[PDB]
Amino acid sequence: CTGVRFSDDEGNTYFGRNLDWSFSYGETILVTPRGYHYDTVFGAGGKAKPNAVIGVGVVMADRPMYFDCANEHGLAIAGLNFPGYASFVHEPVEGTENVATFEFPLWVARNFDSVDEVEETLRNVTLVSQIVPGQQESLLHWFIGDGKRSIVVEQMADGMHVHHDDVDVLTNQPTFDFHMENLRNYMCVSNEMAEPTSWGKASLTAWGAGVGMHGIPGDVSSPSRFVRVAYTNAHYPQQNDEAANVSRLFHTLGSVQMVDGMAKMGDGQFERTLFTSGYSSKTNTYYMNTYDDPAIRSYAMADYDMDSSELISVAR
Amino acid sequence: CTGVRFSDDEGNTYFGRNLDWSFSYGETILVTPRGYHYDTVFGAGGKAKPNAVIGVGVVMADRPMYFDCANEHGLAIAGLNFPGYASFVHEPVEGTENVATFEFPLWVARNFDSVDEVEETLRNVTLVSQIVPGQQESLLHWFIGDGKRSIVVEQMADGMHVHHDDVDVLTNQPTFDFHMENLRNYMCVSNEMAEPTSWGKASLTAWGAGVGMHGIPGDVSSPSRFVRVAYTNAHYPQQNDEAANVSRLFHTLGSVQMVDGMAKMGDGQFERTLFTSGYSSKTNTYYMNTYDDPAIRSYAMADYDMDSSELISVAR
Amino acid sequence: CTGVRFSDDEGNTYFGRNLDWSFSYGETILVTPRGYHYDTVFGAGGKAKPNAVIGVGVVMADRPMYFDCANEHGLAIAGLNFPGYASFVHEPVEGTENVATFEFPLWVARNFDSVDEVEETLRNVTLVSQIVPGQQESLLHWFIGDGKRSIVVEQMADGMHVHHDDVDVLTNQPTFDFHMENLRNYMCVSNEMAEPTSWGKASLTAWGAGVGMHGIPGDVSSPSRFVRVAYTNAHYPQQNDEAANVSRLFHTLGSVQMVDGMAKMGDGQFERTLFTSGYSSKTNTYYMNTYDDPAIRSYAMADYDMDSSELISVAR
Amino acid sequence: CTGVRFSDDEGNTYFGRNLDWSFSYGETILVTPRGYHYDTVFGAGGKAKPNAVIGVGVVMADRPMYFDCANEHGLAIAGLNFPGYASFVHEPVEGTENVATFEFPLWVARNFDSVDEVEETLRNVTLVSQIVPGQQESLLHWFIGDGKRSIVVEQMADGMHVHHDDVDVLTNQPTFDFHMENLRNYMCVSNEMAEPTSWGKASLTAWGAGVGMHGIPGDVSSPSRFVRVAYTNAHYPQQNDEAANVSRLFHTLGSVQMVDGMAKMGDGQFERTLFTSGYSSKTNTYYMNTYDDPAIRSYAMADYDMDSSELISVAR
Predict the structure, then answer these.
(1) What is its EC number (chains A, B, C, D)?
(2) Which of A117, A142, B93, B288 is a good FRET partner for A267, with 20 to 30 A between their CA atoms?
């Protein structure tokens, strides 16, 4: 998985993610309207009037397990795989806001209007992971962004870490810090045309574009993807209308997509980018295409009755 | 630019290309029906009954300048930029088949049914480039593929070279040979999950997928793109229906797309993948999407009257 | 700076290091005899019967200031530059053993006989850095090894980190955990002859030795040296005589040497491997060569009056 | 093998090379006195008054078989392994000067005084390789240099290629043109301290020296050494005394040395830099150290009876 955000010239959120894995099925655009009644698994606080929420997820019980989702005020959250590093308690902790890992995305989207707030309240949040025997424990870290900035939540054996994400991207393992240090290796990689220069008498020129970028890794491992989408996100030129910004989000995400054949998982199956979702706070619209179909489908909040009390699924 | 081909289990052609540049306009899906009357600029031979041809191009005079095109028997050709290396005579040469660079794609598509034939007749072909004062000379090399194999035509100061393209891809400079030697550097890059191993007492494991692929360059220069799409093309698992094969062609081409911001040209403008076209001999259909719109549009030969005498343009 | 440790098949110590800098500080080989009376700057406990000590360093006050040093029982220590990460208190803590930064190398060598003992004491050691007007604090981390293993001491803003050094190697910034994670990127690099493999129909073979090693970085930054000298040291075959182990130590260090012209540091001057030193416990001898002369000179402990009480510097 | 050339500010020759192999062939320093009578295996013209010659090599028949050698007037020559590319006739051509492969180093040294003259003769030279039962042809290319410049002779299936060697460096396969093209990938690598730059809001700085050099490969394959030792040799600052130039020559060569354990060749054995040699024309001295001992020993021409007539081998 990969997460990205950036802004336009007017403070609007553009946010998205690749979902990378051998196979998925059943996930759909999933709407969660203001009037839906949400009971929180460990009785965590709410907000008298909930935000409308849209994302990608599946319904289990009568709850939305979002892979990623956004609300009507420009806040968006995605969960990305993090085993080997993520680690959680299995028991609520008294007089903290106790939130179940699988509900964390709905909870953030529903109750908060900015990264400032999320960050404020995380200081007293306990992310709880409950074991179901024979079901695999979901082991995530989260990427959270609004119109101004993003943060990364990494809950680990030594405690919760909330990092200000200055490159506005996240992928998988190891820790956020490792990735931020690792970028320093690629400091010189550049988008400029490489300037003619000499080694001794030998005159060297670039054949064409891209040579100044030499040095960026191209494999699809988690650290390389981090370096490659960090670079692409940071050099993509600011855009200023919906279409160009959606196009910017998808191309950027596309820079680190996983193609079939590239890379086997620990089970000998190829990991591919199964789908790519995104969000515009400028139009309160969610977007999605898939490995099978690159056409970008839209799902405008405005098309759903945000006062109803029902979860809504759409496709396919 | 990048060119790719592969096959299915039944000998069918899948072929496509990225067109990479700062900006384009006017190019469209362009149909060339059997009954169109083609006069060859230097009176080069024909073929009593011409093949139907579809591609992407623009009309100049009443001729199709194809960037790339395919015919109704599975042969496809693309031209990709090659300045600094491509070099041509400006005068026909007596009693050779003299073909103008800009007409080479129509000529091959129209008159030949296989790479075997093209290759056979190239032995007596002269690629002629005529100067128009103040217009820039088009300086290409060509990628030519059918259901079985591809070749690369590189016309240079020292003569014409026809290479059997065993990796089934082409990008830009320098010579085909350089690229084929350069791949040897990445011999060990692998799609297997990297096997746990040790350095001294230190036990090393992969965080997840992609680590065995470490070593592939990720920049968008011409040699790196060659290595990266060669790898992706060669490890993508064989597919067996139209949809999966079209999807395979686009993802593969996508592995080396140029995103805005990544890389400036010699003029300080960003090079981007403006469009990606492709061809299926299994359905005699051409396909295309663009930087602005990833939805893949189709153009089936079957939808056009291949007996008419008119060039047809479509969009937009 | 690189530091390196390995063993023979009889459990002797081979330890050595490069000193990388712009200019010499007048350093010299330096014996610190057993009957040298030494007063510990913050009254850290000693041990009644002190070890004989040889190393490389300068004299200030009448104090021995060691870059690296080793004792008569096969324990050796090197201090390596770590600005940006290292960070120390400036005042003793009551009822900890309080050791000054610059006396740490002497302190550990004189009082301890193995890595076990040092690791044990470190649990109650406070490393204190003396402010010295308009000079800058030296900010180091430390490499400590005997005939069995290696540790790394990294005193930082958040506390003393003591790491078991499984790759037996150390360099400069960032933290030791970062380097260990980083190694994982290179887990597929091999010292085997690369075997012929195919991409589609292209048959790839190596030109010769080295191809399987492709992916190891070559620059002289701190993380690249870390990777290159870890690889080299883990893959060098065991040797069981003195000559060949000394040779192993210098060849290994040599693989990460900084050559004039390769890299400027902050001041504008080229960083260079000013000297390389190492130590053998089969023979209690310290060895050294310098940028200016690669001849390895040796300095046996047995050639110094160990019960002496003045500290000796040598040269020429 | 690496070969390297550079000059001081007075126009003297500094030339040297690594010999990389699994096992010594018993090679030695080898003087070939002016009054040594030599019969050219295919009757290549000589010159009445032959140059004094020193180098490294073996004696077979009573013939001097040089790995590399240099004459009393500052011209020097090294032969480096080139299987897979090198390729020779086995019979003299009438009215060309016909030189045997293994006598080429002696031949060029004894008869020529500068690279100009050699390049001039090469136009009428036929390099002939003698078939020697159940032994394999030695298949080399050659590195030739004086106080001004460098050439590379590559005799292949298609003819003698003689290249002006602008980077002053040579390694093994593939062809010299390939290496020169390949350098272009690394044209942005720098010996400057990398300057702070930003990706989005992330501020990137180098930990220390070396970061601007990132992108140089570190493995010991032939194309990587080519790049690494070209970089090093082009960036090493000029020196104008004998000591410092000798030091420059060995440090430069050292940056591409093959250390035990790093890379196996076809036979399963580790390839290693068995020795390194070089030559100064300020002082007509040949220098050498070996894997087993880095002490650089020197062998002045003036210490040998140059008018002698038997060829001398030295050691110890």
Answers:
(1) 2.3.1.-, 3.5.1.74, 3.5.1.24, 3.5.1.-
(2) A142
Q: What are phi and psi of C268, to 5 degrees?
A: 95, -10
8-state DSSP, D193:
P
One DSSP character per residue, chain A reads -EEEEEE-TT--EEEEEEEEES---S-EEEEE-TTS----TT-----SSPPPEEEEEEEETTEEEEEEEEETTS-EEEEEE-TTTB--BSS--TTSEEEEGGGHHHHHHHH-SSHHHHHHHHTTEEEE----TTSPPP-EEEEEE-SS-EEEEEEETTEEEEEE-TT-EE-SSS-HHHHHHHHGGGTT--SSPPP-EEETTEEE--SSTTGGGTT-B-S-SHHHHHHHHHHHHHHS----SHHHHHHHHHHHHHTTPPPTTS-B-TTSPBPEEEEEEEEETTTTEEEEEESS--S-EEEEGGGS-TTSSS-EEE--
Q: Which residues of A are catalytic?
A: 1
Cα three-residue angle C71-C77-C83, rounded to 5 degrees: 155
Whether residue B1 lies in the annotated active site: yes
The angle formed by the CA atoms of residues A2, A7 and A13, to the nearest 5 degrees, is 75
Experimental method: X-ray
Tallying the residues shown for chain C, one arrives at 316
Contact C127, C97 (CB under 8 A): no
Contact of B171 with B225, CB cutoff 8 Å: yes
CB burial of residue D315 (10 Å; 0-12, 13-18, 19+): exposed
Structure tokens at A269: 């199956």
What's the token pair of residue A187? 């400091």
D63 is in an annotated binding site: no
Amino acid at D93: V
Chain B residues inside the 8 Å CB shell of A81: 208
Question: CA-nearest residue of chain B to A209?
Answer: B265
CA-nearest of D227, D5, D295, D216 to C256 is D216
**Which residues neighbour B52 within 8 Å (Cβ) at sequence distance 6 or greater?**
B31, B32, B33, B34, B71, B72, B301, B306
CA distance A4 to chain D (A): 12
List binding-site positions of A for deoxycholate.
1, 17
Chain B residues in contact with D185 (beta carbon < 8 A): 221, 223-224
Preceding omega of C50 cis (within 30 degrees of 0): no
Please state the domain extents for chain B: 2-316
Taking only residues 77 to 96 of chain A, the set having a beta carbon closer than 8 angstroms to any beta carbon of chain D reads: none
Binding residues of B for taurine: 81
Q: Quick one: three-class SS letters along chain C?
A: CEEEEEECCCCCEEEEEEEEECCCCCCEEEEECCCCCCCCCCCCCCCCCCCCEEEEEEEECCEEEEEEEEECCCCEEEEEECCCCECCECCCCCCCEEEEHHHHHHHHHHHCCCHHHHHHHHCCEEEECCCCCCCCCCCEEEEEECCCCEEEEEEECCEEEEEECCCCEECCCCCHHHHHHHHHHHCCCCCCCCCCEEECCEEECCCCCCHHHECEECCCCHHHHHHHHHHHHHHCCCCCCHHHHHHHHHHHHHCCCCCCCCCECCCCCECEEEEEEEEECCCCEEEEEECCEEEEEEEEHHHCCCCCCCCEECCC
d(CA B261, CA C147): 53
Q: Which of C34, D184, D25, C302 is nearest to A196 (CA)?
A: D184
- Do D257 and C247 count as a contact with CB atoms less than 8 A apart? no
User: Does D2-316 carry CATH code 3.40.50.720?
Assistant: no
Measure A233 CA to nearest chain B CA, in Å: 9
